[PDB]
Protein backbone atom coordinates (compact mmCIF):
# COMPACT_ATOMS: atom_id res chain seq x y z
CA UNK A 1 0.00 0.00 0.00
CA UNK A 2 1.08 3.59 0.50
CA UNK A 3 2.92 2.50 3.60
CA UNK A 4 3.57 -1.16 4.23
CA UNK A 5 6.18 -3.09 6.16
CA UNK A 6 8.56 -4.98 3.92
CA UNK A 7 8.36 -8.39 5.53
CA UNK A 8 8.51 -10.95 2.77
CA UNK A 9 10.31 -13.92 4.26
CA UNK A 10 10.89 -12.04 7.51
CA UNK A 11 7.46 -13.06 8.78
CA UNK A 12 6.77 -16.76 8.25
CA UNK A 13 3.06 -16.25 8.77
CA UNK A 14 2.81 -14.07 5.69
CA UNK A 15 5.48 -16.15 3.99
CA UNK A 16 3.27 -19.22 4.26
CA UNK A 17 0.35 -17.38 2.70
CA UNK A 18 2.58 -15.95 -0.01
CA UNK A 19 4.18 -19.29 -0.77
CA UNK A 20 0.89 -21.17 -0.72
CA UNK A 21 -0.57 -18.54 -3.01
CA UNK A 22 2.12 -19.17 -5.62
CA UNK A 23 2.15 -22.91 -4.93
CA UNK A 24 -1.61 -23.26 -5.36
CA UNK A 25 -1.51 -21.30 -8.61
CA UNK A 26 1.08 -23.74 -9.90
CA UNK A 27 -0.91 -26.64 -8.43
CA UNK A 28 -3.77 -25.59 -10.69
CA UNK A 29 -1.61 -27.00 -13.47
CA UNK A 30 -3.51 -25.33 -16.29
CA UNK A 31 -0.65 -25.76 -18.71
CA UNK A 32 2.07 -27.46 -16.71
CA UNK A 33 1.78 -31.14 -15.91
CA UNK A 34 0.61 -32.46 -12.56
CA UNK A 35 3.89 -34.38 -12.44
CA UNK A 36 5.64 -31.17 -11.43
CA UNK A 37 3.10 -30.80 -8.62
CA UNK A 38 4.50 -33.86 -6.85
CA UNK A 39 8.03 -32.49 -7.16
CA UNK A 40 6.78 -29.08 -6.09
CA UNK A 41 5.12 -30.61 -3.05
CA UNK A 42 8.46 -32.11 -2.07
CA UNK A 43 10.08 -28.71 -2.60
CA UNK A 44 7.47 -27.04 -0.39
CA UNK A 45 8.06 -29.57 2.39
CA UNK A 46 11.80 -29.10 2.00
CA UNK A 47 11.52 -25.31 2.11
CA UNK A 48 9.40 -25.56 5.24
CA UNK A 49 11.90 -28.04 6.64
CA UNK A 50 14.67 -25.57 5.85
CA UNK A 51 12.78 -22.84 7.71
CA UNK A 52 12.39 -25.19 10.66
CA UNK A 53 16.09 -25.99 10.44
CA UNK A 54 16.93 -22.28 10.44
CA UNK A 55 14.76 -21.67 13.47
CA UNK A 56 11.92 -23.30 15.36
CA UNK A 57 9.80 -20.19 14.98
CA UNK A 58 11.51 -17.28 16.68
CA UNK A 59 14.68 -16.14 14.99
CA UNK A 60 15.82 -14.34 11.90
CA UNK A 61 18.99 -13.75 9.95
CA UNK A 62 20.04 -11.79 6.89
CA UNK A 63 21.67 -14.95 5.58
CA UNK A 64 18.37 -16.76 5.94
CA UNK A 65 16.46 -14.02 4.16
CA UNK A 66 18.82 -14.00 1.21
CA UNK A 67 19.53 -17.73 1.12
CA UNK A 68 15.88 -18.69 1.36
CA UNK A 69 14.78 -16.01 -1.10
CA UNK A 70 17.43 -17.20 -3.53
CA UNK A 71 16.56 -20.81 -2.71
CA UNK A 72 12.90 -20.36 -3.67
CA UNK A 73 13.88 -18.81 -6.96
CA UNK A 74 16.55 -21.47 -7.46
CA UNK A 75 14.09 -24.33 -6.94
CA UNK A 76 11.64 -22.79 -9.40
CA UNK A 77 14.54 -22.02 -11.72
CA UNK A 78 15.54 -25.69 -11.66
CA UNK A 79 12.04 -26.62 -12.82
CA UNK A 80 12.25 -23.81 -15.36
CA UNK A 81 15.56 -25.13 -16.70
CA UNK A 82 14.10 -28.55 -17.40
CA UNK A 83 11.11 -27.01 -19.13
CA UNK A 84 13.23 -24.43 -20.96
CA UNK A 85 15.65 -26.92 -22.49
CA UNK A 86 12.91 -29.38 -23.35
CA UNK A 87 10.50 -26.75 -24.68
CA UNK A 88 11.09 -23.01 -24.45
CA UNK A 89 7.58 -22.32 -25.73
CA UNK A 90 6.23 -23.68 -22.47
CA UNK A 91 8.46 -21.24 -20.61
CA UNK A 92 6.92 -18.26 -22.38
CA UNK A 93 3.45 -19.39 -21.37
CA UNK A 94 4.64 -20.47 -17.93
CA UNK A 95 6.34 -17.15 -17.21
CA UNK A 96 3.22 -15.28 -18.28
CA UNK A 97 1.20 -17.35 -15.82
CA UNK A 98 3.82 -16.82 -13.12
CA UNK A 99 3.86 -13.10 -13.80
CA UNK A 100 0.14 -13.02 -13.25
CA UNK A 101 0.48 -15.21 -10.18
CA UNK A 102 3.16 -12.99 -8.69
CA UNK A 103 1.12 -9.85 -9.26
CA UNK A 104 -2.00 -11.35 -7.73
CA UNK A 105 -0.15 -13.02 -4.88
CA UNK A 106 1.82 -9.90 -3.95
CA UNK A 107 -1.28 -7.73 -4.08
CA UNK A 108 -3.16 -10.28 -1.98
CA UNK A 109 -0.43 -10.35 0.66
CA UNK A 110 1.74 -7.29 1.14
CA UNK A 111 -0.51 -5.31 -1.16
CA UNK A 112 2.61 -3.74 -2.57
CA UNK A 113 3.32 -3.72 -6.30
CA UNK A 114 7.08 -3.76 -5.72
CA UNK A 115 8.70 -5.63 -8.58
CA UNK A 116 12.10 -5.72 -6.91
CA UNK A 117 11.60 -9.34 -5.86
CA UNK A 118 10.00 -10.19 -9.18
CA UNK A 119 12.88 -8.62 -11.09
CA UNK A 120 15.47 -10.34 -8.94
CA UNK A 121 13.72 -13.70 -9.25
CA UNK A 122 13.22 -13.32 -12.99
CA UNK A 123 16.81 -12.16 -13.42
CA UNK A 124 18.20 -15.12 -11.48
CA UNK A 125 15.81 -17.51 -13.19
CA UNK A 126 16.71 -16.21 -16.63
CA UNK A 127 20.41 -16.10 -15.81
CA UNK A 128 20.49 -19.60 -14.36
CA UNK A 129 18.33 -21.05 -17.10
CA UNK A 130 20.29 -19.26 -19.81
CA UNK A 131 23.57 -20.56 -18.43
CA UNK A 132 22.15 -24.05 -18.03
CA UNK A 133 20.70 -23.94 -21.53
CA UNK A 134 24.05 -22.92 -22.97
CA UNK A 135 25.64 -25.82 -21.13
CA UNK A 136 22.90 -28.16 -22.32
CA UNK A 137 23.32 -26.92 -25.87
CA UNK A 138 27.08 -27.34 -25.60
CA UNK A 139 26.59 -30.85 -24.24
CA UNK A 140 24.22 -31.67 -27.06
CA UNK A 141 26.39 -30.23 -29.80
CA UNK A 142 26.48 -31.43 -33.38
JSON list of C-alpha atoms in Angstrom, two decimals, residues 31-32 88-98:
[
{"chain": "A", "resi": 31, "resn": "UNK", "atom": "CA", "xyz": [-0.65, -25.76, -18.71]},
{"chain": "A", "resi": 32, "resn": "UNK", "atom": "CA", "xyz": [2.07, -27.46, -16.71]},
{"chain": "A", "resi": 88, "resn": "UNK", "atom": "CA", "xyz": [11.09, -23.01, -24.45]},
{"chain": "A", "resi": 89, "resn": "UNK", "atom": "CA", "xyz": [7.58, -22.32, -25.73]},
{"chain": "A", "resi": 90, "resn": "UNK", "atom": "CA", "xyz": [6.23, -23.68, -22.47]},
{"chain": "A", "resi": 91, "resn": "UNK", "atom": "CA", "xyz": [8.46, -21.24, -20.61]},
{"chain": "A", "resi": 92, "resn": "UNK", "atom": "CA", "xyz": [6.92, -18.26, -22.38]},
{"chain": "A", "resi": 93, "resn": "UNK", "atom": "CA", "xyz": [3.45, -19.39, -21.37]},
{"chain": "A", "resi": 94, "resn": "UNK", "atom": "CA", "xyz": [4.64, -20.47, -17.93]},
{"chain": "A", "resi": 95, "resn": "UNK", "atom": "CA", "xyz": [6.34, -17.15, -17.21]},
{"chain": "A", "resi": 96, "resn": "UNK", "atom": "CA", "xyz": [3.22, -15.28, -18.28]},
{"chain": "A", "resi": 97, "resn": "UNK", "atom": "CA", "xyz": [1.20, -17.35, -15.82]},
{"chain": "A", "resi": 98, "resn": "UNK", "atom": "CA", "xyz": [3.82, -16.82, -13.12]}
]
